Design an enzyme around this catalytic site. Sequence first.
Site, PDB file in Angstrom:
ATOM      1  CB  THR A 249      -5.114  76.125  -6.868  1.00  0.00           C
ATOM      2  OG1 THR A 249      -5.532  75.117  -6.541  1.00  0.00           O
ATOM      3  CG2 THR A 249      -6.339  76.861  -7.096  1.00  0.00           C
ATOM      4  CB  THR A 250      -2.545  80.280  -6.797  1.00  0.00           C
ATOM      5  OG1 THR A 250      -4.263  80.433  -6.158  1.00  0.00           O
ATOM      6  CG2 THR A 250      -2.409  81.715  -6.839  1.00  0.00           C
TER       7      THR A 250
END
Lengths: 204, 232, 240, 220, 240, 191
Positions: free
Chosen positions: F1-2
């Site tokens: 995700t990040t």
Amino acid sequence: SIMSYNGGAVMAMKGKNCVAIAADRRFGIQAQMVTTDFQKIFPMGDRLYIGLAGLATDVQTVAQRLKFRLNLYELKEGRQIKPYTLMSMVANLLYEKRFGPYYTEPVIAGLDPKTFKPFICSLDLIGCPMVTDDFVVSGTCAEQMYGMCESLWEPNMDPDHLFETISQAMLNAVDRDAVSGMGVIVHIIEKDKITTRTLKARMD
Amino acid sequence: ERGYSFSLTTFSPSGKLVQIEYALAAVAGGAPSVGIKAANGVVLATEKKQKSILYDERSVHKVEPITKHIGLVYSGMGPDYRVLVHRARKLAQQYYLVYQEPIPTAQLVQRVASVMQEYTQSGGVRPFGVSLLICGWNEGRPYLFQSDPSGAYFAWKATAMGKNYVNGKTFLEKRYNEDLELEDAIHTAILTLKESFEGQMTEDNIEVGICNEAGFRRLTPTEVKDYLAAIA
Amino acid sequence: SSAGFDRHITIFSPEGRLYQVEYAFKAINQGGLTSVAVRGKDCAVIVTQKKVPDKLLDSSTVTHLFKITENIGCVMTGMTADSRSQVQRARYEAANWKYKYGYEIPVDMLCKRIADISQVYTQNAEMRPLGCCMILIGIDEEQGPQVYKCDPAGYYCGFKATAAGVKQTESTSFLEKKVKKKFDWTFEQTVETAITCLSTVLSIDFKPSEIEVGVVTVENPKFRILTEAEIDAHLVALAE
Amino acid sequence: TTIAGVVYKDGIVLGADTRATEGMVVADKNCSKIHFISPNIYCCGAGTAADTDMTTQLISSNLELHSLSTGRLPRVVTANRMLKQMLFRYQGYIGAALVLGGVDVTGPHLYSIYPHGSTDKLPYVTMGSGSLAAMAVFEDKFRPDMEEEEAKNLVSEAIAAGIFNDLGSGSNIDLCVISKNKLDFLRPYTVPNKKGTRLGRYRCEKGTTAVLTEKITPLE
Amino acid sequence: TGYDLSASTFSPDGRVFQVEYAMKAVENSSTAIGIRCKDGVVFGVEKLVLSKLYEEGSNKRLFNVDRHVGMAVAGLLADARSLADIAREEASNFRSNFGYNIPLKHLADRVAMYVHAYTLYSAVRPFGCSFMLGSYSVNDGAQLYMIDPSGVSYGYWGCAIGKARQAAKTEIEKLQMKEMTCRDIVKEVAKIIYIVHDEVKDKAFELELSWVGELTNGRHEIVPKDIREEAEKYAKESLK
Amino acid sequence: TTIMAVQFDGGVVLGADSRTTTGSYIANRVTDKLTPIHDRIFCCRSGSAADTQAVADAVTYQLGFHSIELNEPPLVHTAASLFKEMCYRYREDLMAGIIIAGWDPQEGGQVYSVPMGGMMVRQSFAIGGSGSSYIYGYVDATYREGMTKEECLQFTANALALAMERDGSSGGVIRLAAIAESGVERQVLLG
């Protein structure tokens, strides 16, 4: 359902050395029947029939299209067709309309062309085949015929008790059913001959 | 391209198709081969002499399977041969897509001969100077099908195509018969190929494929040198 | 035996010939160029001269050694246009292989695809059959180094002592007289035999500024074009 | 439907449960969902059965073609690339939950395929409706580089837990072993659930049903 | 004789006469030379006024393809216009698809493949054009290429296209090309064009000089030749 | 995700979490979110998985082909242009969180950003992913112009640590990448 737009029920049942296929006679629109002699069981060559149930449009259509391709194959090769090949052909013909689907549940019953090996199978409306050894059912009513066949089936059956078993199963499971009835046609075949009997069904 | 689309092959006052007869002559000027249908299997065998001592026998392979049970050899030109091999491959796999069952050799020969016939008639392209020898053990009985550039086909008990194919054929008629085994067929096939080839014949000059009922098999030079080390 | 228009298009002749392709087998010979490949052991060597009479003409952009992929090199003879077009097609099919099949293309499959495209050009008429010859080299796992040759006709083959261009009846004669003694090929053997066979063909015995040496080895599978200094090193290393 | 994959110290063990239901009814009690691809690569399917079947037969055709063209054993990454490319062409319309495993020259390689076209390489995966029970058994009791019997027992235990959660199968859970040399394939592996013998029986008679029109047609 | 008609056929000795005939079409056209200095490339075209009917500044053969590239054509003019439109289109594509300037090698190779495609079939004729391609980039330096009618494209320091193909490059190669900036090379090209053919076959010609390099900061345009007027005051000192 | 890319003077430093989630269930606990395209150029992706995988493969195709035809090492801005075109042209169906970074021989280290729209910008540091907002909260506080490599590694370590700790979709494991003139150095911070 759209499968329950015209009713319909096809039962196939594997016996010891023989196979029995039966269907109902009724045809009509949602609440209104029309005739008692509609055809749903079709001969595809010798010792090998097919049953179609669901929307009657797709029934007659796919019956004609399969007859087209079958006669093409049977003239390209002098032998007659093997049932797995017919199953694959029906699977392809249904899967070509992956998103334009025919509303039918084909049931194939035929013997071996070389031996007396029986064969039953059934498909989905998109072409998912399924081979069993006891019975395959289709049409609107399902759980009725499931309960009856799981109640009445034995593995090794002479054609007489096979006939009586499939007869009682179809009659009771149709009498409980609403939109499908009005006479039952029965095809009980084997290596030696082809028997077609009709039952005194409740016309209610 | 422009798409000029006319065929070069038209009828003679004799009624012949001289390009097709020339293509058959170009086939007949090719490498010899022998294919024999025995009582249980079919034997294919070609004759592959490299031009120098520099060539390798591990890259180009004459004897070629189309399915796991259908062998296929030729006598002609490899650049056309590979094309129609690849066409037959895609065709057979389309059949196996539709029917979920191995395609029979008669059905192969129908479809391949139809494609080749189509190349005989369509616009501007030359015909393919390749004579196939297709075979396979479908449903017990094995088969043996020769085709030609004309799009036609046949079915032989045993035949030959290439240099001095008539001489090999006349030796086949006297030597070969109806009923043997795969080993005896290999024996007489090596006999009739060695009747016409050059004197130096080794495990790499020939290339032999057989057709069991267990499937197509492509033999190794190991068992060839087991066998062709003075088989009689 | 000129019946019909067999001197003009791709039709069959009397007696089995067709002249357009066997005119293209001397379409290589107007190049005035000579190329030699060698594969004896786990290295593989290309050598090919230049012919630059000009001082105004460069030297870097005149090389025929063409890096097709990171592990596949090649060399060309014949006329330049057909060669470079074949080069772009080879690179394009290599990248298509890498996109479709997820791994690096083998030199065998690529040469087979090139031969198939050669047939496609050969098949129809009104199409010129690309008179260039392509030799490819590369390393494959569990088979080592490979040498392949591609004809204009679409007849590819793969073999050890390899040479095509102008003078290669003589080169293949030297290589029949040479690749028969069963010595191993420990890579200085390969480079020395390549330069000396081209030296016995052309009989010039020249500077390191004329031949380009393309190598690939099973120690670094990357394709490698040699530098002037190490070419000079090998040249004076065979100078006795 | 609960398919699961694992990588032991040499190869891949695949298992599956074979109740192909059509809605709310058990439509099948024996449905092979471990499909053929190649002599070295198999695949397991989940979700829409017909779509998975048609797709895996197309890819098996394509790889048979490519392998017979190449002349050597195929690669798992090629099958992975073909499947992800095809399923991404279909824009996520075709629902096909596939688990791809095979042994190349490089060794064992397991892939899971999500029907939009997202792919992962993992040492163990679970897919299907009851996949969470098998994922529980894995995440509890997985360790790297297991043995053969260890991996077989683990996958059997996983799909057994999946069957004791909802939408398992009555069946004798199917297993499959892919190794560097020995390919094995076991349909009737272990039957935990015997059919309760009917103390009936719902019997009948040969003539108990009213007949209207009989017909005889002999044959050869 | 008979084989020379179609552009797909080969000869009994192995070449294509269509391409050869197209090559010697450019031979009667005007002489156009080009040379690079150490920070730029200089073009120059001997251009001729017919009798009195031109305007000194129409139909300029020094084109300008890209922001840093221009052509120096000789041969058929309208064919050159079409070819330059193709090159403009290709550089436009590259600028659109990658966001920066086209390198000269890749541009010349795309152009060479286009020319080759017009040499292959029988549907089209080969081109009657031979042109120069000049460049300058700070990360690349000066690059000068050269394209025949057949499609063979490589690099030079100096070149000449026209009648005096040899007769200019005889004394092009005695120019100290590396150690000079282009501001000397301007009057160098001036004296080259002025030496060849002063009055013998024709009556009057006229000079154009294109000019790319570091002095233009990577721009490519014609010199203000009238600024510093370098030909004539050196031309009259070049007849002795 | 990040996902996160930070350049320094010598080269760049990349970084991402692992967890690929679907709904509230994690399908994949550990994932190569960042992908090699060329040997000096990475990209880290977010949003949908399948879309970005397909786009990255197509960029790999075109970029490798182009780089071989140049016979020179490729630029970073060129690959940025390729992702820009592929995103912008056939948008309305994709969820691209593409961040391009990599070292270049002409230009050193560069970092390009391609959000879900399809715009292209050159930045010195970058965030991406749903759980990127928080460390975007303080990446403009902790950052100092002119860091070294170890400072960038510790920087992204703290960043992705708090991103994984605070947001539910992030988590898993820290994968870092160090791209420079010298080589490519990947390592996995865990626990």
